[PDB]
Symmetry: D2
């Protein structure tokens, strides 16, 4: 199972042909699970879920999708509210692959796309696993913007290597995870003209009149499926206090908190994360 | 595996011979786990952990101990701070059975005894699983006393069947669990002259000069082992806001919250509870 | 000052004709302040702000409105979501008196009504002072229904004097405020047939399909004016954890919390509440 | 009023001789109030309460003390836990001036010092006003070290003008408070050798074995006097979640929260803070 063995592409229509890059594994398995990645600079499905895909492939039919703007997926230079924009694309891909009701596993930005999909097409989404997710999260104590949001903005404005490193350092509890190779790899992926076009579009998307579609904490009370919320106690991007509204309003919600863990739950606690997801999703 | 097959007794010394009733199962298993029960009227090891012991016996060497004052254990009429009182007894039993460092699984009152043991004899306690526990819990939002504490006091003052039922009803999310047979069984166990002597002692123990030993939320920052905190989102005795200090101060803490679940986690979510404990305790 | 001196009346149109009774004072003064009372059984504008109306009249033009269903206003037998129903009546009173943009003061149901008016009729509302308010509260930690809400529900089903007293005691921190006179007085008011019809018309408006209008926590981020939230630390009806989302989302919010104070701030801490309200509004 | 007019000095004994510098005003007035300043780099009693000392002097006998390490008091090269070290110096100033039981006002480090004195010298303290205070705070949701605490740490390691400005900006909500004059002034003060020795003596007292004396959250339940906590909703140094345990455990506590206010309450909301402080203390 490698980057290349599992690669796949598809074309879907969101206001015009939209290419989605993805990964696929565990092809003989009965149950299909879609993984949606978080959203830093140079982020993608594979670097996000490499400690997870192989483990999840033993039980599930795994589809880890680069979200428009990321990975090898169209970096259009214009889009609306991002989570909606990405759910629409995901809807297209479901329809194509002929997926029915699937369970979604997304962290951070991915979790917001997950939840947005789930509200917009209720019948198509099953159980949710959400790791330090945006959208449905609202920090009741932490002044916004947070440290992690600020460090990302700083990089969006001045995309230096020093700025990227500062950002990656608040991604994790154990800062030893931030190596030279990691910073170099993300910086290269992130400093392309295409990726910066994507970065510009996301930036402009915030002023759109549709901002309310990002405020999912107002809406998750409508969710009917079981939802597993997963947070690192030391998340500095989407802090723990932002889990409360969701935990309170979602009827069949569950919360699991890991001490000594930051924003990258699926990396820093990859083993417990894996087991937790597999078990919550019924073991396949 | 029945009440009677698993019964066992021992005599230990806490300021004089103290008899402890207990249960034992999975006797050929390598790892030993001690279960400590919650503390209502007429509560004991077996009625507390009947949906759990057999499942846990497949993996672990299980010891579910009636805490002095409960079950078939000495109902002295005088004691100090209860958690300390019960840890001392547990220390005696460990020493006797020759247990070394063991993992403790206790809910409510049991969790407080668990934590108190763990602070008082560091070397003897391993991983902790704590369900809606007293002691280390401190409700930052809920006015004290809570609904559940009030309903217990009411029964302590006027031990009627109507009072007991009212208490049991705030024990759970699904109130259908409170049946006629359950109320009758607890009321009979609880209305004996011995049990009321125990109830009187607990009551007097609160005025003791040692009250500070019940305030474990001040102390859990000293815990070094992994701790799994488990709460029902609808706990009306020890509410969710009382988990925050513990989650924050214990270095290797984890929190899992179940929506649609009250104070009796091991009953209302017995299946998920079981798997969670087994996995956290290393599968044996 | 007194009831009949201040007493006054109006007749507006909410899906028909609606009699609102109010109380007027400080007609000399330069700034108009609307008061809105709490929604307990047998509650009305005058007995609610009895310790507040005089003091405020020395600074402002006071209008203490009896909300539909209470006091001497029309107690109809059905209505929709109550706050919006009470905001429609008040908007009606507004245009009838050529009121401009006015500050609003309201505890409990009154607070919910105020917020809802402030959201429905934006040009018409200014500085708001909400004491333990409904609607815009969402108890992030407290299991619903809360203990105070259950007592009220208990009284609607069974409107005895005992059930009312049980409710009134859960209302305050210092229980000596609950004098037998007080109970007699509210219970006299509450047990008329017209009162119980409002009590029943209300309790089934909960089931409307416009329930969402009561979930104001979802909306207050749109509020533009300074809002001051006051809460009693020991409020067992709308607990302190209910204030969080609003403190967070209302741009110009402020929170004051009184320890040793329950659900009736304007009563249990009348002085501090008065002085604080007078200053927040502008000395007038 | 001014520096040298109010200026004053003393010489007490903390494990030797200790020069404390203070500021006196309102000697006419009947009630004595101690002020204790914040602990930023180059901070001192006068510049801290510059917008507060005059107004308070029209009501009380004001004593604004420079804490050991700050302003014109002895900046020694080592000490133990700092609050307790500062409370010992102040108790010394107390007996030297035949002070009785006095109210104490202190933000940040000052608040921590005040609380600690109030716990060490119980007979000597009265009503307390703490603005975003240290020690007695514990951030239940915010990962430590916070963002403001990191900037400070950053300056100690590298005391440039840029690092100081970065710190001062994280101090306030309205950044226009951070004038280049202001930076120049603090940086002039902070970069002397005697200042940096205090800055370094402090930063290594953290490692003492008396660290526990700084964990005041563990103790405040013992406080008997009325305490008013004031906090800025957007405080990025000691965030709002830090106020919870104290609001909960201090019997006669009160909390006021300002939106659009950071870590310097006495500055960003000087008027409200003054009026609120004057009233809480008794008009004097």
């Amino acid at each position: 199972l490698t980057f290349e063995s599992t690669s796949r592409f598809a074309e879907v229509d969101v206001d015009g042909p939209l290419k989605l890059h993805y990964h696929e594994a565990g092809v003989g398995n009965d149950q299909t699970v879609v993984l949606l990645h978080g959203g830093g600079p140079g982020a993608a499905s594979w670097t996000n879920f490499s400690r997870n895909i192989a483990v999840l492939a033993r039980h599930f039919h795994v589809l880890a999708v680069d979200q428009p703007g990321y990975g090898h997926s169209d970096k259009r230079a214009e889009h609306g509210q991002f989570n909606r924009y990405a759910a629409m694309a995901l809807k297209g891909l479901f329809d194509q692959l002929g997926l029915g009701r699937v369970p979604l596993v997304g962290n951070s930005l991915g979790g917001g796309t997950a939840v947005r999909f789930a509200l917009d097409y209720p019948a198509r989404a099953g159980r949710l696993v959400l790791m330090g997710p945006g959208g449905l999260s609202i920090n009741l104590f932490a002044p916004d913007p947070t440290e992690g949001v600020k460090r990302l903005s700083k990089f969006s404005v001045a995309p230096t290597r020093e700025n990227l490193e500062a950002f990656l350092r608040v991604m994790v509890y154990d800062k030893n995870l931030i190596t030279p190779e990691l910073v170099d790899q993300r910086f290269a992926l992130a400093s392309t003209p295409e990726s910066l076009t994507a970065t510009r579009a996301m930036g402009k998307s915030f002023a759109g009149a549709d901002f309310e579609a990002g405020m999912m904490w107002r809406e998750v009370y409508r969710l009917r499926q079981p939802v597993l919320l997963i947070w690192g106690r030391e998340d500095r991007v989407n802090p723990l206090d932002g889990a409360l509204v969701a935990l309170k309003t979602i009827p069949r919600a569950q919360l699991h908190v890991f001490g000594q863990c930051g924003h990258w739950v699926q990396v820093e606690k990859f083993d417990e994360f894996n087991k937790l997801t597999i078990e919550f999703l019924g073991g396949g």
